[PDB]
Design a binder for this molecule. Structure first.
Ligand SMILES: Nc1ncnc2c1ncn2[C@@H]1O[C@H](CSCC[C@H](N)C(=O)O)[C@@H](O)[C@H]1O
Ligand SMILES: [Zn+2]
Ligand SMILES: [Zn+2]
Length: 882
């Protein structure tokens, strides 16, 4: 009935070619081929616009139709082009982008365009339910082209109705996609918006003639019906004259880099870090400068210098594992597994999301509770043991395989040089004088295997290193916590220090033997970023149990290194180099250290202790902001009465915890947990915690555990996890373009680990024997299979896997009384077919059957690719391969 509807009918009538000639008739078009090539090849530092629509917005921007100012909100950001264009503008202070980005639609894109650090994307979000927030620039580009004008009208009035809520909040500028402005209802709603907010609809000359879309912008007014019918007129006159000749305009190229932001910096003890920052500043005088575009909001930024870039965003595929695991080529849970982006870019955006947060200081009463529970906990941990200095000889012996770490080229080469220990003696003297000059953190990226985000690699968590001397000073001052097993289960009740993955399940099962409610195993969202200054001062209680000579050194580490940190982080820089930024705060720690694990276990013991005190109504919510000596003495007596029992109801490894409380009130004790910033991951701040019914389903150290019965009726507790995680992690190789010899040794290492810990999963045992049947027998397993401290590496030997199996499970297992060894592989049991299927096995499917029949042809393929060597057919140790 309307002229636009006539355009819709006449448009549907056109065939393919006439559609193609009317699509580009007299429109303005940017050439996207170069940018599309850049984004196909994975280049994210070129600055090209990530979508056509960007240019659209640019038009509206540079002729006054919309101003981009202040806080920008983008409803339906898609790839994110409008967010990037807005973020590259000086007049913009922040950008929040939301999009569905699921089920076919385009997912957000992470690129280095200018202002990338002031954008916050959130996919899998329905904008129609998102409560409007106050902003200064409201953008919306939502609307799907349909063939029925009724569909366009209903979707359009839905969009405008939702946008009306966001406009009610009082926005200065806006640009809202009106998909079908020719429909009468859309005209009425638009007219009401014109009376209530101003603005008008504007046809964008970059819009293809295949859509009738116009844009409600705030920088002009006109008669809605008149200009809409004029745009319909133009679209019809263009349909009648189908020339397809396009007007030309240049595509969008934006600059790269970060932008400054409003800061929320806390106190900084400049005098404490002055010597270190001046040493770094002097060693790199040729590059030193203060970058006024640093993205740090909560970290104090001190300066930057220039080095070479490092890390990779690529994920290398282990060839033999990927070929043997072909039936999983279509599973997303395995294919989405990849290496972590260790480039300064992904490093820096992980720093943005997770590390650059602002911490809440625990309120006064919660702090007092922390002091009481902490002091009690340290009084109980130091009942038997005595703190002690660790020796140079212990350190040199530990250099066989250590962690958290230019005159020398190897650690062993440095600890053999007396000049190194001269430097150590000098920095130790400095620490004794209350000065520190070289103990600096280098925050480099950790090559981990994570699930890809969007379809590209997820950023890399950072592990903090120090030079060899600083780690020796830390080890001398506080290494006794590790070397004397302070976090042991015998010394702490809740600790699990020393117990490997093998025997960890016996702890959970033991907790299941107790009385009480369900199991709780809550993950903390970024534990290291939530360790407060209060947690650090609480951990400094060890100083009160030391000799003066020891307390001075340890105090120097704790105060000058853990609190007054100096951290060096990589950030992308022009050209092929990178900026090294020197930043500092007081309220975080790094996971790389080996003393980190002990103090995280102790502090988590304190945390779960407090939460259990709230769950038993010793303390509760009113006691958050403050606390009387009455309830404080109550808590004291409660620790006296039940402290050691509650500790024994815990399995704590660093930030991982498993608590078996008296009752399920534990799931609702959240006041102090949230007050201490130990916020639970993947849950609402005040939503009750997920309980657990069957202990065999409780997660701990990335695993769950099952009870298995051997052929001879005996029982063992085995670890298990989703098979998709094991295969996806086994399918990825760290190094670049490696030799088939390296990745074959890595594959043999994975096969040995699967044989040792995950033998009871049928695809995993068949996979192990297949791998060790395609890899030369005389080759030695190398590489890293796990990052867990509970992975003792027993599978990394050239031994027969059956004998290390009988060793760890029968010979060296304290829970196995009868030490009778198992003779053949076929006598080693499997999980129940139900439990195996429930934990990711592909048994039953005909693709795994065909896989198991044709696995030998693939084995021969891999042997051929590796070349001429001595192989062995291990598969004969299975029933159906004799
Ligand atoms: N219901 C919804 N809620 C949020 N975003 C949606 C949505 N439906 C579609 N979208 C997203 O909105 C995007 C529109 S493209 C417009 C945004 C911008 N021009 C750009 O892509 O760079 C699509 O990519 C789609 O993924
Ligand atoms: Zn130092
Ligand atoms: Zn399982």
């Amino acid at each position: 009935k309307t002229l636009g509807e006539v355009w819709k009918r006449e448009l549907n009538l056109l065939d393919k070619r006439q559609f193609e000639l009317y699509k580009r008739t007299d429109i303005v078009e940017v050439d996207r081929d170069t940018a599309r090539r850049h984004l196909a090849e994975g280049k994210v530092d070129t600055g090209v616009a990530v979508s056509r629509g960007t240019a659209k917005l640019r038009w509206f921007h540079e002729r006054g139709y919309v101003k981009l100012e202040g806080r920008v909100i983008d409803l339906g950001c898609g790839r994110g082009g409008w967010c990037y264009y807005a973020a590259a503008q000086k007049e913009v202070s922040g950008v929040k982008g939301f999009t569905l980005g699921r089920d076919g639609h385009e997912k957000p894109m992470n690129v280095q365009s200018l202002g990338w650090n002031i954008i916050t994307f959130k996919d899998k979000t329905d904008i129609h339910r998102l409560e409007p927030v106050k902003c200064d620039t409201l953008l919306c580009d939502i609307g799907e082209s349909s063939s029925s004008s009724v569909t366009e009208g209903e979707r359009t009035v839905r969009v405008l109705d939702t946008v009306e809520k966001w406009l009610a909040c009082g926005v200065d500028n806006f640009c809202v996609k009106v998909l079908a402005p020719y429909m009468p209802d859309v005209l009425e709603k638009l007219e009401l918006l014109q009376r209530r907010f101003g603005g008008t609809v504007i046809r964008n000359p970059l819009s293809r003639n295949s859509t009738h879309e116009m844009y409600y912008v705030s920088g002009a007014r006109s008669n809605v019906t008149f200009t809409v019918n004029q745009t319909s007129r133009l679209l019809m006159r263009r349909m009648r004259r189908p020339t397809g000749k396009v007007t030309l305009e240049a595509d969008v190229i934006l600059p790269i880099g970060t932008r400054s932001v409003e800061t929320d910096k806390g106190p900084l003890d400049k005098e404490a870090i002055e010597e270190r920052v001046e040493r770094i500043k002097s060693e790199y005088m040729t590059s030193w400068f203060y970058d006024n575009d640093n993205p740090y909001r909560t970290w104090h930024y001190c300066g930057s210098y220039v080095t070479k870039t490092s890390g990779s965003a690529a994920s290398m595929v282990n060839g033999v594992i990927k070929i043997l695991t072909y039936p999983w080529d279509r599973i997303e849970e395995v294919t989405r597994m990849a290496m972590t982006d260790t480039t300064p870019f992904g490093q820096q955006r992980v720093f943005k999301e997770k590390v650059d947060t602002r911490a809440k200081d625990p309120p006064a009463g919660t702090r007092k509770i922390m002091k009481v529970v902490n002091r009690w906990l340290f009084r109980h941990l130091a009942r038997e043991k005595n703190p002690r200095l660790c020796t140079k000889e212990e350190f040199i012996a530990k250099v066989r395989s250590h962690a958290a770490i230019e005159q020398w080229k190897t650690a062993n080469e440095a600890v053999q040089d007396p000049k190194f220990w001269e430097l150590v003696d000098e920095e130790r003297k400095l620490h004794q004088q209350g000065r520190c000059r070289t103990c600096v953190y280098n925050m480099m990226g950790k090559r981990e295997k994570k699930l890809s985000e969007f379809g590209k690699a997820k950023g890399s968590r950072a592990i903090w290193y120090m030079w060899l001397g600083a780690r020796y000073l830390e080890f001398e001052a506080l290494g006794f916590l590790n070397e004397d097993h302070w976090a042991s289960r015998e010394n702490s009740g809740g600790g699990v220090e020393g117990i490997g993955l093998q025997y960890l399940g016996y702890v959970i099962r033991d907790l299941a033997a107790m009385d009480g409610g369900g199991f709780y195993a809550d993950d903390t969202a970024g534990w290291d970023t939530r360790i407060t200054e209060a947690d650090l001062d609480d951990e400094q209680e060890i100083l009160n149990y030391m000799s003066p000579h020891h307390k001075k050194l340890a105090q120097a580490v704790m105060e000058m290194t853990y609190k007054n940190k100096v951290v060096k982080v990589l950030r992308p820089a022009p050209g092929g180099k990178a900026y090294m930024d020197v930043i500092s705060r007081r309220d975080q720690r790094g996971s790389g250290q080996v003393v980190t694990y002990a103090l995280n276990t102790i502090t988590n013991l304190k945390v779960q202790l407090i939460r259990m005190a709230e769950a038993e109504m010793v303390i509760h919510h009113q006691h958050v902001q403050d606390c009387d000596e009455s309830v404080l003495t109550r808590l004291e007596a409660w620790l006296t009465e039940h402290g050691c029992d509650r500790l024994k109801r815990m399995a704590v490894s660093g930030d991982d915890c498993v608590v078996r409380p008296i009752d399920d009130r534990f799931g609702l004790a959240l006041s102090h947990l949230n007050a201490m910033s130990k916020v639970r991951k993947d849950i609402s701040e005040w939503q009750p915690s997920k309980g657990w019914n069957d202990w065999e389903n409780v997660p701990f150290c990335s695993h769950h555990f099952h009870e298995l019965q051997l052929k001879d009726g005996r029982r063992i507790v085995v670890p298990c996890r989703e098979q998709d995680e094991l295969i996806g992690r086994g399918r990825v190789s760290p190094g670049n373009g490696w030799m088939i010899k390296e990745t074959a040794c890595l594959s043999k290492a994975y096969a040995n680990m699967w044989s040792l810990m995950y033998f009871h999963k049928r695809d995993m045992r068949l996979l192990s024997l297949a791998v060790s049947s395609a890899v030369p027998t005389s080759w030695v397993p190398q590489g890293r299979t796990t990052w867990s401290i509970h992975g003792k590496g027993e599978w990394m030997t050239t031994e027969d896997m059956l004998e290390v199996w009988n060793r760890v499970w029968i010979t060296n297992n304290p829970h196995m009384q009868d030490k009778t060894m198992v003779k053949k592989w076929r006598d080693v049991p499997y999980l129940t077919k139900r439990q195996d299927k429930l934990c990711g096995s592909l048994i039953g499917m005909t693709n795994r059957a065909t896989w198991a029949s044709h696995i030998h042809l693939v084995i021969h393929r891999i042997r051929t690719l590796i070349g001429q060597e001595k192989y062995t057919d291990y598969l004969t140790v299975m029933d159906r391969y004799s």
